[PDB]
Structures are given as structure tokens and as C-alpha cells.
């Protein structure tokens, strides 16, 4: 089981644990598929240079990269989908938004997502962002 409190610890120390939970950033899974990126990291609120590039090359290093590793998810619509994203009451706002078939979730940009389904947070985004598969 993988926390962020334990591998921030590790990293440093438990001072951004709040901000990354707060900032969406609770789940290590955020990071499991597409390492953290510098927008991100420096996005949240970092306290100051110097560990940009520690959280940046940590979270690189991180060795949860594996050929096995190549399970996907196949859902029928906006339910199931956020289902496997740890999220589900976006379901409401995706559904009342117009987002009916997945088709849909690539047919929008950044500024849309954050105009339309109003997430403002890095962790839910790259979550997202992520299960789709935009670039």
C-alpha cells in the first residue's frame, strides 16, 4: 500500500502531505502511471526551490515501472468509468455537464475541463487527464 504521507516522508518530510491531499493529491496512484510533473509539483505550493527537483527526480526514480504492468480498464459510460479513477460524485456533474459517452470526455481542452466540470485540482485532474489518455 502506497501513501503519500509515507513516501513524501521518505522523500523529505511530512510538510506537504496537507497540500498534495488537499491539492487531490491523496493517492500514490495519482503518480503510479505518469510521474509527477514540474507544472505540478510547483502548481500545488511548494515552500521553496530545491525540492522541485528531488520530489521530480524521486517520484521519477520511483521503481513501479513494469512490463506486467499493462492493465487497462474498459468502462460503459461516465459512472463506471470514474468508478476506476477513485471518483464517483463526479458522475453528477459529468452527466448534468452533457458527458453521455466517453467520446465526449476527448472532445474538450484543458480551460473546458476546468470551465465545465469546475475541478480546479491537480490531483483529480492528472487522475483524469490519465484515464483518458488526451496526449
Same mark, same amino acid.
Given at each position: 500500500?502506497?501513501?503519500?504521507?509515507?513516501?513524501?516522508?521518505?522523500?523529505?518530510?511530512?510538510?506537504?502531505?496537507?497540500?498534495?491531499?488537499?491539492? !487531490?493529491?491523496?493517492?500514490?496512484?495519482?503518480?503510479?502511471?505518469?510521474?509527477?510533473?514540474?507544472?505540478?509539483?510547483?502548481?500545488? !505550493?511548494?515552500?521553496?526551490? !530545491?525540492?522541485?527537483?528531488?520530489?521530480?527526480?524521486?517520484?521519477?526514480?520511483?521503481?513501479?515501472?513494469?512490463?506486467?504492468?499493462?492493465?487497462?480498464?474498459?468502462?460503459?459510460?461516465?459512472?463506471?468509468?470514474?468508478?476506476?479513477?477513485?471518483?464517483?460524485?463526479?458522475?453528477?456533474?459529468?452527466?448534468?455537464? !452533457?458527458?453521455?459517452?466517453?467520446?465526449?470526455?476527448?472532445?474538450?481542452?484543458?480551460?473546458?475541463?476546468?470551465?465545465?466540470?469546475?475541478?480546479?485540482?491537480?490531483?483529480?485532474?492528472?487522475?483524469?487527464?490519465?484515464?483518458?489518455?488526451?496526449?
Amino acid at each position: 500500500v502506497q501513501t503519500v504521507g509515507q513516501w513524501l516522508e521518505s522523500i523529505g518530510l511530512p510538510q506537504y502531505e496537507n497540500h498534495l491531499m488537499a491539492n !487531490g493529491f491523496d493517492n500514490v496512484q495519482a503518480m503510479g502511471s505518469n510521474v509527477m510533473e514540474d507544472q505540478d509539483l510547483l502548481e500545488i !505550493g511548494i515552500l521553496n526551490s !530545491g525540492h522541485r527537483q528531488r520530489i521530480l527526480q524521486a517520484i521519477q526514480l520511483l521503481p513501479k515501472m513494469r512490463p506486467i504492468g499493462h492493465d487497462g480498464a474498459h468502462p460503459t459510460s461516465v459512472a463506471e468509468w470514474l468508478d476506476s479513477i477513485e471518483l464517483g460524485d463526479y458522475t453528477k456533474a459529468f452527466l448534468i455537464n !452533457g458527458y453521455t459517452s466517453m467520446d465526449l470526455l476527448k472532445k474538450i481542452a484543458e480551460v473546458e475541463l476546468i470551465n465545465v466540470l469546475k475541478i480546479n485540482l491537480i490531483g483529480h485532474r492528472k487522475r483524469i487527464l490519465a484515464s483518458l489518455g488526451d496526449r
